[PDB]
Structure 1
Amino acid sequence: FTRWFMSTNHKDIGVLYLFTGGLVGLISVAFTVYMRMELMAPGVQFMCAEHLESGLVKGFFQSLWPSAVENCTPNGHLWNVMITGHGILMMFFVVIPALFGGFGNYFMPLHIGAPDMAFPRMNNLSYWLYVAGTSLAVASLFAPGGNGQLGSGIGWVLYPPLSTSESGYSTDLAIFAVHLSGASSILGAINMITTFLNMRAPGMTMHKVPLFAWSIFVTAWLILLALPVLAGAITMLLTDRNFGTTFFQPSGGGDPVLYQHILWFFGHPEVYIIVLPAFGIVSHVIATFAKKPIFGYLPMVYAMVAIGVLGFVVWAHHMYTAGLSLTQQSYFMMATMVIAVPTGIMIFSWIATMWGGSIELKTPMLWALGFLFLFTVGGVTGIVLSQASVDRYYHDTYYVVAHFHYVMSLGAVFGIFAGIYFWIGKMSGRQYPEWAGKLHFWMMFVGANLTFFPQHFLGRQGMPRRYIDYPEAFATWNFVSSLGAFLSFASFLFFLGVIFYTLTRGARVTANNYWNEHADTLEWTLTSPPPEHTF
């Protein structure tokens, strides 16, 4: 029934987060398909001004079919709206809601032997604020916006004066959306921290807490510091747009660069809020399927804490070309390099955890190993970008896009997939079919590499970010990238098939622990699914 939505139980809320995150993921992924349809070839074939003169619905379907260049007036604003929609949905309404709100709410309490979250109704509220925020973001796409069209074509980070001068009220809706999102994450963090601190089961000591619970804990702290700052940043945009302030407008004494400092002060932490829960999931998964315990438990906790705190003093590496002094450029370069040490080290610990084990190549372990390959490919590419001298060339090119899709987008996505296959049995009492999980993995892994690796070539050749159209010479690797993205999309549709199949007619789960003895955390001592009231 409706009930579901009124539940206050950490298991029910985690499930709600996972499903909603998955549907929004579907929408944002669909946006990327459309993006890749347009980037597949030079010249604009899909995003034609001519489609505006039709209705919303007829205009939609016309824009999914290619036109001859001679019949297609390039509509740059639609490109910029899609890109912004894609990025905003992913960064606020997809991966954190699924990792933190989803697996966080479900499994952190079970990991620490807590009966429920400290503030159950507050947890129900956080979900509703996420949904309200999602609604406003989606709504902004249909609201009067820039250049006398719908939607905001301003990029996920909302730089002024572009963001502050975008026509209509679409941008205001998007700001509200982000407020509601931050609120959602703030409540969630309060709840995670309080629970972690006050409600550990008798015997459960900080040094005996499972890594996933740790990763959620550290993530919750970064949220408490980072999200209020973002809320400042975006209120300042709201006041410049509606209430005559001039924080970012030079004619009133403003500096647009001020916004960047404040936004990126959130913006970096944000990328660690995304992967930390994935770090948690990868640790449990590798331990389980290597049938070994976690290598260097304590150094992992410290690495996670170090990264969490150092991620607050690196922001301006997103600003090497915004007009920072040589001294600032140099400091931030070195801070960024220091944080690269405990980050890259963790690859070694996971390999060490496999080393000497008894390795079983089941689907969750595939995702975990993929995570290790992709995280590395993304990370080394961050090394390059950290050198401001070389960032001069790469900044605002497809090389940066390749970097973050490897390290951040796919890292989170492979983490999410590892978790789902690892725990669907536990959460539902039904098991996924092994061959399909493996097939999903190979399609997704081949597809994601075809999509993003060639974007490195595009960056090197100088292809800028946020372009609806590009010079002829960028054609080849854009074409390969788009084929990879279509294959990835097929892998995901197939995955939705696999999930539908699993939940409606998957093999019945019989055991508390359907893996093995080395899946040794508390959820495996409970039934599948766990009882309504646990512990």
Structure 2
Amino acid sequence: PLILGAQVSIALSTIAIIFVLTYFKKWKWLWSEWITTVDHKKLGIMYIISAVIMLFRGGVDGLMMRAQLALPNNSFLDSNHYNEIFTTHGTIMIIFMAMPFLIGLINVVVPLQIGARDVAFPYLNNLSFWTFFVGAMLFNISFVIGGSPNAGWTSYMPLASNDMSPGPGENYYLLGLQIAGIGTLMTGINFMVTILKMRTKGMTLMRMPMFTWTTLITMVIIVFAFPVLTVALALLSFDRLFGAHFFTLEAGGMPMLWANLFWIWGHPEVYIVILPAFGIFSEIISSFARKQLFGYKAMVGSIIAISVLSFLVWTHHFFTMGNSASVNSFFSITTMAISIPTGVKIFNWLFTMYKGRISFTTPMLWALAFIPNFVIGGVTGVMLAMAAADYQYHNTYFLVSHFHYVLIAGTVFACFAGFIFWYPKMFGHKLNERIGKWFFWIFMIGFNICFFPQYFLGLQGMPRRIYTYGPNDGWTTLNFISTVGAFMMGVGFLILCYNIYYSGVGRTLDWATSSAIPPHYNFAVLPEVKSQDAFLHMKEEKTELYPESKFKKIHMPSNSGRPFFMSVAFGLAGFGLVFEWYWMGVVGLIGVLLCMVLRSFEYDNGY
């Protein structure tokens, strides 16, 4: 309680700082060219700068957690205000960090590589940001205004309603993700239509090239694995608020049914956080290598396998609860059938880097380090797929050690790779290469001495979600080593922000823009392409530019202030149902009232 009193003042200070320094006059720059803007380039920016903000929020969280877990009998954090702490850390990632960080790198890089103007509905994509953001402030305001949930990012049902007890805990998780799920659902719908009907002439479907293909796969899984989340929480939101008994222990409802609904959405979304990560790494390793992605009838054909085989594998997170054995081997054999379509994509990055040249720049290093660390986590998930041995290392850190290798090397590195390799798109010049190398090395070495002792921590006998281990066979140092490496990755986020204080060998339509920071209309003429890689065939082979006297008109999808007002209603009704208001919501119905009024304005505005 003592710690949470300083940040509410710091939270009010930051709010008080925006008024004096920034709000001298903002209804001409903040409300016009931003907030409710339509240009796809500006939206993708607002996605990742929230993920960096959540990185520090997730950062002080991840650090003080392991700082508490330095050694046994440590009195930094108590039983609770750790459960809430470690729950906020995990939900801030994936949902409010890796999702906005990935879609942001998608909401920017994909529409330029296809030659189109904006996206399909540059109007519905506007609210698609705020729909996530009001869910971010909802889940962030659980800080001191209410109480952050303390059931994990999973938050199973039997420990979530009355057995749990905190009122304003799970509701932020239910209503916070319920909104962002609506926003994230529309981001998959916009980009599923943008990459199918707005491509430029000559841009053939089979070659466009491969990252824009992974994004296509990313925005397909979102469409079919988010309506589940929309009802899985809505069912849970009915259990919590309106008094439903879908999974309640009392009226006899199935406590495990909410587990299977969450995971029917769970593991498919797990690939939504790794699909764009694969794509962002597919260009960079074939761009500064100056070679051809050798393999398409077996690499893009491999990107479709994991897209469907993600829903025949989701039952691998259970196993321990004693299923029908046969059904515990079905998804066990099937899970091994998911590490093979994922496996061939690693053999496709090394033979596109061989025979070809290379220059170790900063974005190369992130692609250099992505190859091993993701496999070291992948050579452990194969073990997790074995249901017969999953019962021994279920939970117990060895699971935590598996996936932290999979996602941080997978997505967090791709979030860092897409950060630097496509930074000249965002503003002038780029990051300093030599001192940017200092951030790469320190963040990489602390990553392993943090989670590889967890492979020994978990196998020796340290379960997960535990605030004190105890002197068990001298297994204290493996825990402290994990914390040293944990606090070591923190050292670096200061460097990451210092590199920001300073304020190429392309092979696709990246540097093909008229100059740095491409304009609003993006590309005056649509490229003919008619080949696999556009930039190299449009540099050495001929020239081909944007000749004058061949221009035409504008797009004119101007701004409308409704998406901001639309999501505030979602954030207002969401906050109103969470913070007290147990049975029914006095203001929760108004948010429903305001949203439907704007949905009439949706089809009452001619443009």
TM-score, normalised to structure 2's length? 0.79
Q: Would you say 1:393 and 2:416 are equivalent positions?
A: no
Matches within 5 A, 1:26-105: 26-47=56-77, 75-100=78-103, 102-105=104-107
**What CA deviation, in whole Å up to 9, does each residue of 1:125-151 have, x standing for no partner?**
11111110001111223354xxxxx32
1:468, distance to aligned residue in structure 2 (A): 1.3
Distance 1:170 1:140 in 2: 7
Which structure is larger by alpha-carbon Rg, 1 or 2? 2
1:409, distance to aligned residue in structure 2 (A): 2.5
For 2:274, what is the secondary structure of its paired residue?
helix
**Match for residue 497 of structure 1?**
498
- Are the counterparts in 2 of residues 236 and 247 from structure 1 also a CA contact under 8 Å? yes
- Are the counterparts in 2 of residues 81 and 141 from structure 1 also a CA contact under 8 Å? no
For 2:52, what is the secondary structure of its paired residue?
helix
**Match for residue 533 of structure 1?**
521
**Match for residue 116 of structure 1?**
118
Match of 1:134 among 131, 136, 154: 136
- Are the counterparts in 2 of residues 384 and 390 from structure 1 also a CA contact under 8 Å? yes
Q: Would you say 1:331 and 2:330 are equivalent positions?
A: yes
Distance 1:291 1:96 in 2: 30
**Match for residue 508 of structure 2?**
521
1:12, distance to aligned residue in structure 2 (A): 0.5
Distance 1:216 1:437 in 2: 27
For 1:290, what is the secondary structure of its paired residue?
coil
**What CA deviation, in whole Å up to 9, does each residue of 1:179-216 have, x standing for no partner?**
11111111111110111111001111111212121111
**What CA deviation, in whole Å up to 9, does each residue of 1:41-76 have, x standing for no partner?**
1113111xxxxxxxxxxxxxxxxxxxxxxxxxxx21
Letter in 1 for 2:431: Y
Distance 2:501 2:271 in 1: 31
1:232, distance to aligned residue in structure 2 (A): 1.4
Distance 1:26 1:389 in 2: 39
Letter in 1 for 2:509: L
- Are the counterparts in 2 of residues 163 and 237 from structure 1 also a CA contact under 8 Å? no
For 2:291, what is the secondary structure of its paired residue?
coil
**What CA deviation, in whole Å up to 9, does each residue of 1:471-518 have, x standing for no partner?**
2233111111111111111112201111222xx0xxxxxxxxxx12xx
1:302, distance to aligned residue in structure 2 (A): 1.6
Structure 1 residue ranges (4+ consecutive) displaced by more than 4 angstroms after TM superposition:
none
**What CA deviation, in whole Å up to 9, does each residue of 1:201-240 have, x standing for no partner?**
1111111212121111111111111111012111121222
**Match for residue 261 of structure 1?**
260
**Match for residue 350 of structure 1?**
349
Distance 2:74 2:64 in 1: 12
Distance 2:143 2:395 in 1: 24
Distance 2:522 2:54 in 1: 30
For 1:285, what is the secondary structure of its paired residue?
helix
Letter in 2 for 1:282: F
1:250, distance to aligned residue in structure 2 (A): 3.8
Q: Would you say 1:16 and 2:46 are equivalent positions?
A: yes
1:323, distance to aligned residue in structure 2 (A): 2.4
**Match for residue 62 of structure 1?**
none
Matches within 5 A, 1:370-449: 370-449=369-448
Letter in 1 for 2:495: F
Q: Would you say 1:360 and 2:355 are equivalent positions?
A: no
1:346, distance to aligned residue in structure 2 (A): 1.1
**Match for residue 512 of structure 1?**
none
For 1:173, what is the secondary structure of its paired residue?
helix
Distance 1:235 1:322 in 2: 25
Distance 2:55 2:132 in 1: 14
For 2:343, what is the secondary structure of its paired residue?
helix
For 2:466, what is the secondary structure of its paired residue?
coil
- Are the counterparts in 1 of residues 148 and 172 from structure 2 also a CA contact under 8 Å? no
- Are the counterparts in 1 of residues 182 and 230 from structure 2 also a CA contact under 8 Å? no
Letter in 2 for 1:523: D
Letter in 2 for 1:135: M
- Are the counterparts in 2 of residues 109 and 116 from structure 1 also a CA contact under 8 Å? yes
Distance 1:250 1:422 in 2: 51
- Stretches of structure 1 that go unaligned for 5 or more consecutive residues are 48-74, 145-149, 505-514
**Match for residue 160 of structure 1?**
157
- Are the counterparts in 1 of residues 113 and 509 from structure 2 also a CA contact under 8 Å? yes
Higher helix share: 1
Letter in 2 for 1:528: A
For 1:78, what is the secondary structure of its paired residue?
coil
Distance 2:298 2:59 in 1: 36
**Match for residue 461 of structure 1?**
460
Q: Would you say 1:281 and 2:269 are equivalent positions?
A: no
1:241, distance to aligned residue in structure 2 (A): 1.7
Letter in 2 for 1:299: A
For 1:154, what is the secondary structure of its paired residue?
coil
**Match for residue 224 of structure 2?**
225
Distance 1:393 1:244 in 2: 37
1:520, distance to aligned residue in structure 2 (A): 1.7
- Are the counterparts in 1 of residues 281 and 414 from structure 2 also a CA contact under 8 Å? yes
1:274, distance to aligned residue in structure 2 (A): 0.3
For 1:294, what is the secondary structure of its paired residue?
coil
Distance 1:298 1:28 in 2: 40
Which structure has more relative contact order (CA 8 Å, sep 6+)? It is: 2
For 1:113, what is the secondary structure of its paired residue?
coil
Distance 2:209 2:59 in 1: 32
Letter in 2 for 1:31: D
1:396, distance to aligned residue in structure 2 (A): 1.1
Distance 1:193 1:428 in 2: 28
For 1:524, what is the secondary structure of its paired residue?
coil
**What CA deviation, in whole Å up to 9, does each residue of 1:18-56 have, x standing for no partner?**
211111122112200010110011113111xxxxxxxxx
**What CA deviation, in whole Å up to 9, does each residue of 1:78-132 have, x standing for no partner?**
11101110111102100111112x1111111111111111111211111111110
Distance 1:244 1:18, change over 3 A: closer
Q: Would you say 1:6 and 2:36 are equivalent positions?
A: yes
Letter in 1 for 2:185: I
